[PDB]
């Protein structure tokens, strides 16, 4: 058989796109450890969209030269960031929606967006629109903390993370569905991946091993295990429960 | 001999001194790179027997080698075919890893020519050989008969052909029984 489409992922022409055009998608910069009245903390400036996220963001000023020229500080968009209200940070910070501050300082059952989870990453969890995680691993969880990430599963965290308290801005992808597919293709150019899809049974067993038969059906198997090769591993990857 | 503070240690590296000392001197090399200098030698006893009647120009550099065997690409696409070469770490070859260390310093510092080397132990990262390099300008060395030839132009890249002890083993030199066919060069008898 030929080269399967899932193998063409690591490199490719379809795997190139605009990188430096992207002004700064939503990490978090240096923002003051202290809050001895605060040093590096200020107001929100502009509201600008970075490509990659598919949601509005913002610019912020602190104590440092940030309106135009210095290209870095992008601030996490909560409803409704704009000119004339302050952000605060620090360790033992003031707990408000729109303030970036620790997980340790917030009590159990606070919703948080743009949150770290490994030992430092600037900003990982829930950067775009709609998204948020839920910190519920303090109190009888004594030393090592735990964000219970939104499905059901795990993640052990030491001290770990800062993040903005709240639910993030937007809400118009699940809350409001689209209309057509060329307007959906605006996703797959700010992200690098093939689009759309053709059926596995419709493709030849040559090009993808889910084909086979004059009366078309699945040739090999739909459930394939985790430890497998490239063309071998397709379909539902380890169907733990069917149905 | 009297130098059983180098010799006793160099032959028996298993001793209490060098399994401690070469642990902290391989640690020293985990910081350092392709080439790096050494002061007066680590084993100056074998260094003098090779050729280290000193002067500046007579330097010594510790150099790394490679990992794997004789590496080639991995089988992408097919795996079978005619399986003449299947493995990624397949064959070895004639030359020792002395030569590998010697030409990495040899073509970087082109002016400084290769004499001969010895091993100074290793870690799990690479093997390390200390290459003694000479200088072709350096006199006293040119006034010595022992190092006259090495300075004059024919004895540039002694490793690349077969003049250095390691490059002798690329042709056919050890004195013994089947030295009759493999007397001169390997291509003179033509691989027999």
């Amino acid at each position: 058989g030929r080269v399967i489409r899932n193998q063409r992922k690591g490199a490719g022409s379809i795997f190139t796109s605009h990188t430096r055009l992207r002004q700064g998608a939503a990490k978090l910069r240096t923002l003051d450890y202290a809050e001895r009245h605060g040093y590096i903390r200020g107001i929100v400036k502009q509201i600008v969209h970075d490509s990659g996220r598919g949601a509005p963001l913002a610019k912020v000023v602190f104590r440092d030269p940030y309106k135009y020229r210095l290209r870095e500080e992008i601030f996490i968009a909560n409803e409704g960031v704009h000119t004339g209200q302050f952000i605060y940070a620090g360790k033992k910070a003031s707990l408000n929606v729109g303030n970036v501050l620790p997980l340790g300082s917030v009590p159990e059952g606070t919703i948080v967006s743009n949150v770290e989870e490994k030992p430092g990453d600037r900003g990982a969890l829930a950067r775009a629109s709609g998204n948020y995680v839920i910190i519920i691993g303090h109190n009888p969880d004594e030393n090592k903390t735990r964000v219970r990430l939104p499905s059901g599963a795990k993640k052990v965290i030491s001290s770990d993370a800062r993040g903005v308290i709240g639910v993030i801005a937007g809400g118009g992808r699940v809350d409001k569905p689209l209309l057509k597919a060329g307007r959906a293709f605006h996703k797959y150019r700010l992200k690098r991946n093939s689009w759309p899809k053709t059926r596995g049974v419709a493709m030849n067993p040559v090009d993808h091993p889910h084909g086979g038969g004059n009366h078309q059906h699945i040739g090999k198997a739909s459930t394939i295990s985790r430890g497998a090769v490239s063309g071998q591993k397709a379909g539902l990857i380890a169907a733990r429960r069917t149905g | 001999g009297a130098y059983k503070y180098l010799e006793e240690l160099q032959r028996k590296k298993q001793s209490d001194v060098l399994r401690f000392l070469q642990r902290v001197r391989v640690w020293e090399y985990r910081q350092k790179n392709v080439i790096h200098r050494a002061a007066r030698p680590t084993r100056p006893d074998k260094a003098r027997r090779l050729g280290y009647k000193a002067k500046q120009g007579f330097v010594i550099y510790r150099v790394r080698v490679r990992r794997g065997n004789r590496k080639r690409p991995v089988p992408k696409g097919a795996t079978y075919g005619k399986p003449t070469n299947q493995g990624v770490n397949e064959l070895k070859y004639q030359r020792s890893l002395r030569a590998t260390a010697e030409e990495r310093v040899g073509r970087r510092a082109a002016n400084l020519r290769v004499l001969n080397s010895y091993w100074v132990n290793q870690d799990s990262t690479y093997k390390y050989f200390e290459v003694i390099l000479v200088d072709p300008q350096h006199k006293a060395i040119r006034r010595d008969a022992r190092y006259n030839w090495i300075c004059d132009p024919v004895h540039k890249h002694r490793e690349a052909r077969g003049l250095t002890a390691t490059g002798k083993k690329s042709r056919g030199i050890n004195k013994g029984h089947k030295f009759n066919n493999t007397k001169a060069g390997r291509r003179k008898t033509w691989k027999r």
Partner: protein, 113 residues
């Protein structure tokens, strides 16, 4: 260093360096130190610490203790050879022939050893 086994004090370490114009003859160099030993031509051995590489100086606390002179550690090399009065900065030295200092030289050797 890992060289120094038993040690002397710093104030008397200086007084060991200038053990050349107060005895008579002195040889210099760490070869001539290990050379010194059998027939007891070396009396005081002046072990410097600061000698590169350290493989040279690890002879001196061992070899010179087997066949056996009472050595003593000088403070450093930089004012060892200078206080002998040679050319260069001597890596070690030994006191060979004694002048008047035998009784004084006895408390250069036997303080450490």
């Amino acid at each position: 260093e890992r060289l120094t086994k038993e040690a002397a004090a710093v104030a008397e370490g200086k007084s060991k360096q200038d053990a050349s114009p107060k005895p008579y003859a002195v040889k210099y160099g760490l070869n001539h130190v290990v050379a010194l030993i059998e027939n007891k031509k070396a009396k005081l051995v002046l072990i410097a610490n600061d000698v590169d590489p350290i493989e040279l100086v690890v002879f001196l606390p061992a070899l010179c203790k087997k066949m056996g002179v009472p050595y003593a550690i000088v403070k450093g090399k930089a004012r060892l050879g200078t206080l002998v009065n040679q050319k260069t900065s001597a890596v070690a030295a030994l006191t060979e022939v004694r002048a008047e200092d035998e009784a004084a030289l006895a408390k250069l050797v036997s303080t450490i050893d």
